[PDB]
């Protein structure tokens, strides 16, 4: 529609000449076309929430509106594609405006000026299934299946041969009418239909032993990493997605730092995938917002990504979404709800915070689509408070929605080891329900190991304090034996690198064997003090060193290295 500005208070604009306006409608206020959005109408005028700040805008101008509700854009070009929280490409902004950004910028949301490949995976006279088959685009990532959106099962006519076609160019049209192009529009505030929501049963690799093998959340979890970034914690976040079994990674922040957040972007093409063997950048979607970015950019942040992962899901890809700075997301919302009638009433935050918080996790997880394909939307909830109070809205709300805290502590970080997971200050409520499927698919005694072995560390935590104040030397062999076994798990097993290639990428068939041997050494060590054996002898065994060499080898040498290492233990307490 088309209307006229009446007021300008703040960044927000209010303008009459609106009538028959939709809710969450496309608004480009003024003759400057600032990216805005129609919201809550009032009278013959409307309230307009303009993301970009206004300061050149005068009242009484024309306001062009599309008259169609804002939707997320889904097409090719997204894999190996830089975008922000409004979803414009931040580098074609750099070329068309320069280093600096001058507001009222509108460009296409996807790379639509490229000629993208095509292959028809359907033909005319056949019927399509929603959420699946239309045609694929070969790319230099893997593939990208450009599929028709849900509830479109009709007959197709005119499917054109494999070649190169622009996103806006057609390759297919329907027999029953209603035309379609490679770009697809899906609603920002709605999620796609499913057939079952499944149960999680395929473990979610993270490529570092301790992280997933000890505390799994499997594929379709919801996790969290607390405490602010800058404690070397960012080590964890990059390497996570990097090693982890998937085929697409989506990285997203909102209210994240200055220059520290631009180190991440340039170092992102310098991260390298293990599967493809080339950069992670090939198969990564960015929609990050910095903090110079518009008001509601950060506030819309979340929702985008969610949707976008569901696209890749329907295709039959595994996605890995990384929700950085969940805590700072709330900043914007507070600001917006203040200037309206959604005023604070909880505790220093609006009470609609909890509502907008939930849905982000609710509408993600490992589920099966209409297209019949599987994929997961594992979320790892970096809250990152400045300190966090349990009587702060942010903390006591999140705490409930996620099932895991994969807590790292500061003491543990100074020690320069990743995994740095502080086991006593971590938990994951999943474990229970994951034991059936673990031994089904993975291996026999794998669950049996994990739950059993954790106790070492437990029965060490309270032990060391001030009871063993000078080591044990006045203590019994009972209590001595715990810290002999304690030595190998915390200097070999807890430690691992992420900047050596021999142990940055691990897998099950490697981790399992490591973990078995360290049980079997508690089992022959505690039996040693009933035979009459001192720890002096234990401290000179080549076995301790063999545990250290089983991670200074990779997964390929593991078979041979497992033979020798295993049988060595059995013949190194039958010598004692």
């Amino acid at each position: 529609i088309q209307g006229v500005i009446q007021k300008i208070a703040g960044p927000a604009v209010i303008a009459k000449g609106m009538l028959g306006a939709r809710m969450y409608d496309i608004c480009k206020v003024g003759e400057e076309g600032l990216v805005g959005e129609i919201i809550r109408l009032d009278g013959d005028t409307a309230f307009v929430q303009v993301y970009e700040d206004t300061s050149g805008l005068k009242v009484g101008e024309p306001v062009v509106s599309t008259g169609l509700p804002l939707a997320v854009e889904l097409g090719p070009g997204m894999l190996n594609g830089i975008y922000d929280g409004i979803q414009r490409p931040l580098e074609r902004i750099r070329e068309k405006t320069g280093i600096y950004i001058t507001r009222g910028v509108v460009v296409h949301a996807l790379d639509r000026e490229k000629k993208w490949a095509w292959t028809p995976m359907v033909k005319p006279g056949d019927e399509v299934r929603g959420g699946m088959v239309l045609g694929t685009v070969p790319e230099f990532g893997f593939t990208h299946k450009i599929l028709v959106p849900p509830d479109v099962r009709g007959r197709v006519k005119e499917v054109k041969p494999a070649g190169e076609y622009t996103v806006e160019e057609p390759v297919v049209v329907l027999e029953d009418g209603t035309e379609l192009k490679m770009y697809h529009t899906w609603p920002v505030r709605r999620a796609r239909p499913v057939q079952r929501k499944l149960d999680p049963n395929t473990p979610f690799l993270t490529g570092m032993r301790i992280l997933d093998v000890l505390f799994p959340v499997a594929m379709g979890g919801t996790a969290a990493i607390p405490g602010p970034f800058g404690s070397g914690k960012t080590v964890t976040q990059q390497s996570l997605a990097k090693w982890s079994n998937a085929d697409v990674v989506v990285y997203v922040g909102c209210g994240e730092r200055g220059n520290e957040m631009t180190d991440v972007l340039v170092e992102f093409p310098e991260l390298t995938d293990p599967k493809t063997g080339g950069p992670l950048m090939h198969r990564t979607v960015l929609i990050a917002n910095t903090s110079n970015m518009p008001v509601a950019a950060r506030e819309a942040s979340i929702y985008v990504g969610v949707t976008i992962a569901e696209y890749f899901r329907d295709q039959g890809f595994s996605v890995a979404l990384m929700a950085d700075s969940t805590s700072r997301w709330a900043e914007a919302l507070r600001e917006i709800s203040s200037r309206l009638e959604e005023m604070p009433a909880e505790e220093g935050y609006p009470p609609y915070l909890a509502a907008r918080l939930a849905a982000f996790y609710e509408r993600a997880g490992k589920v099966i689509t209409l297209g019949g394909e599987e994929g997961a939307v594992t979320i790892v909830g970096a809250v990152s408070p400045p300190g966090g109070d349990m009587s702060e809205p942010v903390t006591q709300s999140t705490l409930r929605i996620v099932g895991a805290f994969w807590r790292l502590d500061a003491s543990l970080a100074f020690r320069r080891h990743f995994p740095a997971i502080n086991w006593n200050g971590s938990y994951s409520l999943f474990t229970s329900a994951l034991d059936p499927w673990y031994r089904e698919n993975v291996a026999e005694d794998y669950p049996e190991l994990r739950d059993a072995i954790s106790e070492l560390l437990q029965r060490e935590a309270g032990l060391q304090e001030i009871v063993q104040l000078v080591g044990p030397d006045a203590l019994q062999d009972a209590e001595r034996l715990v810290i002999e076994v304690g030595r190998i798990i915390r200097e070999d097993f807890l430690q691992q690198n992420a900047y050596h290639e021999v142990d940055a990428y691990c897998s099950m068939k490697k981790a399992y064997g490591i973990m078995k041997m360290i049980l079997a050494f508690y089992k022959e060590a505690e039996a040693a003090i009933k035979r009459g054996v001192s720890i002096d002898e234990i401290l000179q065994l080549p076995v301790l060193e063999r545990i250290g060499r089983a991670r200074y080898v990779s997964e390929e040498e593991f078979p041979a290295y497992f033979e020798e290492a295993m049988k060595e233990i059995q013949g190194a307490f039958k010598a004692l």
Binding site: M343, P344, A345, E347, G348, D389, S391
Partner: protein
Amino acid sequence: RVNALEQVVIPGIRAQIRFIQQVLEQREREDTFRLKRIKGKIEAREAEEEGG
């Protein structure tokens, strides 16, 4: 001291900030509610120039 600290002291020195906090915070409901009705007056006044 250890024993004592983990009970009466430490979470007690916590609950003091917490109790304080919450009452400071809740006070500011009345602030906003009053300020609301203030707004209502102001607009009501400029709405008698142009109507009733």
